[PDB]
Structures are given as structure tokens and as C-alpha cells.
Amino acid sequence: DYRKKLLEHKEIDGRLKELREQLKELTKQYEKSENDLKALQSVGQIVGEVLKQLTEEKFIVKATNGPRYVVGCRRQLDKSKLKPGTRVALDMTTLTIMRYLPREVDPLVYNMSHEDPGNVSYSEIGGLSKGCLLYGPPGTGKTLLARAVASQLDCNFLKVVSSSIVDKYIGESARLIREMFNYARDHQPCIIFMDEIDAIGGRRFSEGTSADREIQRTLMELLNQMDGFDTLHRVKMIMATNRPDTLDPALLRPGRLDRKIHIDLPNEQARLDILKIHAGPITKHGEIDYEAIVKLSDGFNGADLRNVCTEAGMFAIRADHDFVVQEDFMKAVRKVADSKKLESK
């Protein structure tokens, strides 16, 4: 009688205290709406540029539209940013200065905006314990590793695509080799990725045309800036490719590509580890046997092992069963992997 009323009143108090969370969470957004409505009241600002300063308090501005004006100094800001050569902002009323406007560029936004998240990818590369060569044996995942450390820190996102040395016009790409590598020499930290270098890695065995001679000339600038008269002790380049046969044996000197990392699945612990990190979110029957999958798989591709395992999940989902036995894993990784061996020419 008395002992039950405390628990029952605790239940009424529970269902009474469980209704506040449905409102007090969205009231912060509702008040944030009026906060923004009070934040949109600062309107009517224009821009300008500073060329010549006569008086320390009042100087000449140059508007983007073309007409020039002269403005004063606001009591809040100081003469630090007031020096000439810095783009500033103006107001329509009294031509006061609220703050400045830092300059930028179009490709600089692309070079300073792309960021890939994910910190576990550095530990999801599997059992893997002045230049690096990532060649293309029957094993993939170089993009997951370069993008795994690149997604971890990379200290930047200075990605160098092999399609950026096209130079449709006259082959003066030396301005881009010295411009971008001059940016690498300017910025103290820098990491360079060179993915799919086989397209620009022509062996120039026969007499090359004007299209090949300019790319090989950019390779001559690479020679002159790797083993020429310029050291690269602090900067690092990652040469990724697909076929380790046409990789410019002149560029295969150990002066640049110190070590060789064969992206494969040789070790049983590496194949089992990558199989377990790709087999994370998969559900299956309690009967687990990964030693047959790891043992029967010999020299395969990592991301394509993910595609073969998910392909076995599609083969198992054809019969719309929630649980997935490992029979379709052994026979579907077996048969589909044998189809990859057929298409592995």
C-alpha cells in the first residue's frame, strides 16, 4: 500500500520528466532563429583597395567598380592592418572601415579547402608494419593508404594529379614544375602525391612526337630537380602507378625511390587483418571460418577483395536472407575471385 505509492509516484514523475527533452532541445534552435535575425542587421558594407597613403589617419581607397574615394580611420581598429597593400572593406554611410578583406585565388580555394576526415583509416591499412614508389602488382589499396595518412594528418592536402601536366598550349610546363615545387620549397611542410604516373611515364623508346617530347621534358625537369642542383631532403613525393614495367628505368634510380612497397596481400596476417576490417559491419551466421577465405585467396586486390566479399553479400541477398552463411563466401569468393583471375590479364 505505502511501499507501492513511492514507485508509482516515481513513475508519474518519470513520465513527467521525460517530456521536457522533446521541447528544451528545439527551443535552443528557436532562440537561435532570433539570434540570427539579430545577426543579419549588419548590412550595407562595400569593399576597396589601398594603393597610396598620404595621411596616417586618412588614406585613399580604390573601389572594385572603378571610382576611387578617400576614407578615415575608425576608433576601434589600429594602424597595423591600415598599412597600404591590404584589401579592406568600407561602409556606404560615412565611409567607415569595419575590417579588412584578405586576398586569396580561384585554384587556391581548391588547394586550401579539400579535407578528408577519418583517423581510423591510418590503422585500417592492414598488417603493414626522398620518394616512395607505389607500384601495381596484383593487390590494390594504395589510394586507401595514401588517403589514409592523408586523411589522418598529411599536414596539408597538396594532391598532384597526373592530368595537371597536360599543357594544351606550348609545352612550357616548367613554370608549373618550378611554380608548384617552388611552393613546396616555400612552405616548410609539404607532402606530394603522384597517383597514376604510368600515363606520364612513357619510356620514350622510339622517336617520340611533340606530345611525348614535352612530357619527357617535364621528366627532364624532374631529373634536374631531383638529382640535378636542388636537394629534396624535407619534401616527400609518393609515385603511385599501375604497372611496374614501364616505370622509366632512368627514374627507377635508388637516389629518388629509396624503398619499394609492393601493395599486395602476401602475409596471412595481413590478408586476415584486411579481411576483418572489411568484415566489420557485415552480419553472418555464428559459424565463422576465415582461414579458408584467407588460404584460398592468393595474390588478390584489397579493395577488389572488398568488392568480392560484398559481391558475396549480394549473392546471399539474392535469396533475401538476413543471416548469411559462409558457404556463399567460400563459393562466391572462390568463383568470383576466379573470374578476377580470368580478367587479371
Binding site: D13, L23, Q29, V43, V47, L101, V166, A211, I282, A303
Partner: protein
Amino acid sequence: KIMKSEVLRVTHELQAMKDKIKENSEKIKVNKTLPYLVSNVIELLDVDPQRKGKCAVIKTSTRQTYFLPVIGLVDAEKLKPGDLVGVNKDSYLILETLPTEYDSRVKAMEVDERPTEQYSDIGGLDKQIQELVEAIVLPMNHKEKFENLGIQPPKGVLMYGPPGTGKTLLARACAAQTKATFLKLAGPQLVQMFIGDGAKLVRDAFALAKEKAPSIIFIDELDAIGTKRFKAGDREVQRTMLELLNQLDGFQPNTQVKVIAATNRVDILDPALLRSGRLDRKIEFPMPNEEARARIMQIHSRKMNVSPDVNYEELARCTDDFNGAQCKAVCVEAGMIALRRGATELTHEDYMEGILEVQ
């Protein structure tokens, strides 16, 4: 329950807030009614040293540059360098941002809602088309089960084979089953007179696929531009093409709308087209035999008044090393001269008459 009696005052304050938000939330309709012009937005992060640094660069349509910080409502897909943003008369604030087109010559490439033909128009290809029918049905309805199994569907399927096999009308026939928006695109369309057009076409394809609703983008004649040359125009198509592959390799959020491709020949096979997001599904579509050609010609000719005395042996013998769309042209030609033949019923000589007529 005496300590829980103060909750009533809190609920009265909250319902009073819901009673008082109707006015300041009501002026949203009269202040945010209509942006009178269109102004381009360029994102540029500033630093104030709350007093936090946040700003943006504005450019009006009349070539006038002004100053304004990043303002407005809760932004999720905003903050990108896009156009068609909300703006008042002279306050020049950002109120309603929506991504815009222009250069309609690429935006209205192939505006198709849904086609007429379906997957039940062919015969003898279920063993190889069933994988694609699954690969377009299960990623559209079974998205819930993709979290229990941790499955991400591939975005690049290589529908390769000899020409004339119907690799376009059949993928469109499956696009009728996709129920999504169908959007064609031709290979040579990337080769333009001006420089940098291919970047605008590719970023336009991923602009409508990324921005728009779940759709279907089927391209064809990719082999005509997929040449791996070692100046050269196909190296410019290596700039645009390798740019597209960079947008299929460096973009992990590419789990959105797929990109279906079809090549009429695999002579110049780009080795860099092997990846989970890239053209990994390589299902070979050979030339249909006389049996399969009689099947697709029978189901494609099941509407015309065909004579019942067809043993398929004469047409099976005449159809040697032919393709699907060729027998479709034989069916259409038979439906063309069968009208002027007087007999409303399709005869048996019209098969070889069309075969020797157009070929």
C-alpha cells in the same frame, strides 16, 4: 511529487515561447518573400583577431562587388561558390541559397522523365542482365539492409560489347525499372572548341547528380574518347577523363547516384578504370546468336500481326553475325513495307526482304 510541481511553470514558459514565435517567425514570409536579383557568391574565410572571423565575397550580376559576412539560417549544403542566392534591395544579405544552372546547353542535355520500353522486351539475356536488374533494384529499395550488412553499391558498371547490340535501349529499358530520372550523355560532347569545357560538363554531371534527387545517368560511346595516348586531343580527354576518375576516386561521399557507362569496343582499354567506384562490373555482352536474335525479334515483333507459320529456321539461317538493333531494324522495316504489301498480316519473306534490303 512536490519537487516535480515546478515543471508546470517550465511548460508554461515553453508554450508561451511557442505562442510568441508566431510574430517574429511570421515576418520571415514578408522579409524573405522574393530575392529581386541574382548574385554570385564566392566563399572566403576571414579572421577577426565571441569575435570570430567569418566572411564571404559577393559578386552581383551587374558586376558590382560588395562586402558582407556569412549570414542566414542554418546552412548544410551552402557555403559553396554557387549562384541564385537570396538578396534584398540594398541590404545585400543572404536569405535563401539555392544552386543554379545557366549555360542551359549542357543542363538540358537529355531531359527524359521515364521511357516506354521495359526489361521484358528482350529474350535470352536474363543470365547476364539479372545481375544489373538486381544492381539497380536492390540499391534503390533495400537501403535499410545496407547497414546491417555494411554494403555500398558500386558506382561504375561497364556495359561493353560489340556495337549494334542495343546497349543503349536496353540500359534505358532497365532505367524504366529504376523509376528514377533518366539523363543521357554522349562521349563526343566533352570535346568542345573552348578550353576547360570538360570540367564544366563533368562538374555539371555531378552537380545534377549530387544536387538533384536520386536519378539515373547513362552514358555511351565512352570508348570513342577513352584513348590512352602516350599535342593530342585525347590527352585533353585524359585531363577531363582523369578528372572524372579523380571524382570517382578521391570522393568518399560518392555513395550517391550511380554513373552507368557503356563502350562499343574494348580495343583501347584504360587500365585505370578498375576500382570499387569505377567501372568494376565488367559483364561481357557478346553478339546474340540466331536463337537470341529470334527471341528479341519475337518479343520486339509480338505487336505486329505476324503469321503463325514461322519456324524461325529460314530467318535463323539468314541472320548470320548480326546484332540486336539490326534485327530491330529488320522488324521496323517489315512494319514499313508490310503496310504497302497489301496484306495486313506479316509474311515470312519480309524477314529476308528486310535483311537484304537494309543489309
